Design a protein around this ligand. Structure first.
Ligand code: ATP
Ligand code: ATP
Ligand code: ATP
Ligand code: MG
Ligand code: MG
Ligand code: MG
Lengths: 301, 299, 302
């Protein structure tokens, strides 16, 4: 129950004003309730009086009162944890990737940040009883490393139709930072008509280094990156989907944006070691995994 | 003895005018005595004549004369200090978190600002004789980092019923600065029916960076934050509860009474340092983050 | 279908402004859509208003919306894979050299970086049904190791006219880094009038060590190399040709994401050589052995 924006018109908001909200980026009742007063006023063709009518009726459908901690604890029992393909890696995450939050994977090059994303892009279509999310996947690529054939190998592992998996994965390559943020506007509208479960941005920081290379323009890219991260957190709270982003390390804005940070480093041979950095519920522990032809699997020395 | 506002009606003020004061945020005689003349005039449906009647009769129940330092010293002896879970950390605070004042914890990410809040959200329910506050907990979250499972582990450490602990913790996530301030209005009404002891805002500065990002709007966000901090100080003086806020790293200079700096040590160990304080000396203390909550370091 | 830049003039942009885009390096509508806002504004005689009209109308011809994974799978199915001459080496690359992307071959001296380039310079002229690209070859040399006689021996192996093979190979030796980058401007104009299929730069890192030898100039050569690498990746997306560069490792961290497939070469017994794949999004870490024969790069024959 994400409260479609069409129900906001039933409260009293005229249908023409709803069109302005959809083109602005708001497609749910929870989105306008998330927005302050200044967000609706800045929209073209919306006065302060019209903004107050939206916030009042939006709070009726989505209440924001105080709830008991035992109630929010039961809300965590309804959270879906997507498997990563490795049993030892799933134990490290106390179940898997938590939906509705941003997960950051920072590590050296060639470690396997992109490989983990391709594996998760298929496991989200798995049934919920098998550790999936029963939703479509969304892959935003910036390195040119997207390979649909790698998705077919993961589908064969769990016995899913490779053709149906590719039909449920949306792909788009961002050419620049302005294009990278612009793709999120189309992403919000697509998640309203169909159910998605995973949003992948690989890489989320590559385009911010090539465009703004000067020293006086450092504050400019930080303003653009902060605005890009805020839209990711809004989409996570809006649709309850898992957000996975990659970062290349040879960065203080992705501190509070990410809810769970993962550090990847290379081990002996094809084995890799993963460690949890920042997390509110998971303890600092490590787990070993490997990168096989079937995707991300368990280590087999 | 904070003089509830119901006694103000007994002096001569009609009860209907008192209802307008409660909807504004004033629920005690000390609260309306705290407010100047301009605060009551700005309230809808209150004239200057009605405001003068309130302040005059409020001074009878709450006098504003000079008192001996030994008398105010005994009033500070009644202040409750909530334990933090670490014995070395409790010694640093000369007892623990002081109720009725704002405590700010500023530090880098992953230091443990949220972990201290979850630990204090359970230790505040302990009996006062056991180092608690004998009151419910209130958690206002802005990062999405609230974990009820962390509260259960701390409750099992001190031998408390996990179900009863979750029933005594109020949780609400603020989506923006306007929503963050709006939650305090509901918070004041909840503290009237039941006794609370701790108010947590994590983070108190995160939403003020996401909403107001421009440069021409810099003066606007400072006015909204200053008004938010004054409401926290008003709630602390009104109900005598502890206010704990986190900040990720000038307006919170005089607003905050005790500042705590957190930095990471080797492994799971953490180091805490006191920044600004009128009674606590500049000292440091070491603590750890265990599965049972915030405990002492054990090399 | 890369949408040539001449179609951008049909939308409303005057043809004279399009001429400035060709002199800058943009020859398709997908190229100006690839470029951000700052790239077009920095060009002499182009204002922000003219740049906004280009980017807006370019998005109309080349949409930048989300596509199904099955659609991008068919886009990779249309990519031409040029054979390397060794059957075991072609199996290692899941087909051959991928066009439209940069392929790096880093290895010690005498391993065979130059020999592989000469072999690919002839196999690209083969028919696509025979594993070729049906396009001309372009060789940018920096070591003075270009030998047309090696091209004639490879042409005799595949039964091609040696005279016609030499007529379809463009050669130019870069004397310095500034000359190395300047040759790419001439390369873009040549690929518009005639069809090319392969661009070879051997070596792509030799001139950046001899020219910039000081320590205070280290940050200067990295800016020039990074700008040079971006132009190679842009030409690959623009013309859909394969880009092969060689590097001596006694590599750089800037060619990390720029290169799509890295190959490591080491010497075996005799004339045999061993090849290994380093970084790749689709190819697994595996090794393959090959040899250097008089006919070019062939399979190992103990
Ligand atoms: N088909 C495959 N089968 C098995 N293993 C593979 C396959 N393809 C790639 N790998 C392995 O996965 C790794 C790929 O690393 P990856 O491309 O994910 O790095 P990355 O984190 O994306 O770095 P960057 O994005 O900065 O280039 C390689 O080291 C390789 O060993
Ligand atoms: N179950 C657990 N057992 C032991 N330690 C834990 C457990 N869960 C979390 N931790 C530790 O507590 C820390 C949590 O950091 P925390 O989330 O408090 O940072 P923070 O102050 O909220 O930073 P920010 O709010 O700016 O993101 C982690 O570094 C982790 O090592
Ligand atoms: N006509 C030929 N017949 C057989 N083998 C040959 C012939 N010509 C050259 N070779 C072999 O090919 C190899 C050439 O190595 P090559 O010049 O490709 O090294 P490289 O990778 O260019 O090193 P660098 O360019 O860094 O000096 C020689 O070792 C030689 O044995
Ligand atoms: Mg990658
Ligand atoms: Mg936190
Ligand atoms: Mg060579």
């Amino acid at each position: 129950g994400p409260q479609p924006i069409s129900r906001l018109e039933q409260c009293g908001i005229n249908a023409n004003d709803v069109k302005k909200l959809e083109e602005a980026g708001f497609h749910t009742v929870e989105a306008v309730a998330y927005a302050p007063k200044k967000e609706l006023i800045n929209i073209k063709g919306i006065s302060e009086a019209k903004a107050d009518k939206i916030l009042a009726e939006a709070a009726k459908l989505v209440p924001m009162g105080f709830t008991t901690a035992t109630e929010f604890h039961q809300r965590r029992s309804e959270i879906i944890q997507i498997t990563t393909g490795s049993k030892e890696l799933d134990k490290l995450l106390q179940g898997g990737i938590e939906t509705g939050s941003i997960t950051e994977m920072f590590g050296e090059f060639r470690t396997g940040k992109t490989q983990i994303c391709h594996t998760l892009a298929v496991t989200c279509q798995l049934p919920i009883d098998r550790g999936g999310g029963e939703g479509k996947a969304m892959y935003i690529d910036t390195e040119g490393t997207f390979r649909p054939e790698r998705l077919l190998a993961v589908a064969e592992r769990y016995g899913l139709s490779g053709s149906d998996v590719l039909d449920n994965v949306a792909y788009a390559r961002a050419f620049n930072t302005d294009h990278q943020t612009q793709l999120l506007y189309q992403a919000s509208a697509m998640m309203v008509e169909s159910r998605y479960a995973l949003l992948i941005v690989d890489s989320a920081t590559a385009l911010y280094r090539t465009d703004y290379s000067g020293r006086g323009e450092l504050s400019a890219r930080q303003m653009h990156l902060a605005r890009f991260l805020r839209m990711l957190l809004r989409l996570a709270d809006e649709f309850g989907v898992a957000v996975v982003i990659t970062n290349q390390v040879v960065g203080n804005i992705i501190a509070h944006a990410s809810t769970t940070r993962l550090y990847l480093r290379k081990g002996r041979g094809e084995t890799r070691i993963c460690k949890i950095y920042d997390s509110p519920c998971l303890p600092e522990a490590e787990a070993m995994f490997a990168i096989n032809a079937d995707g991300v699997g368990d280590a087999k020395d």
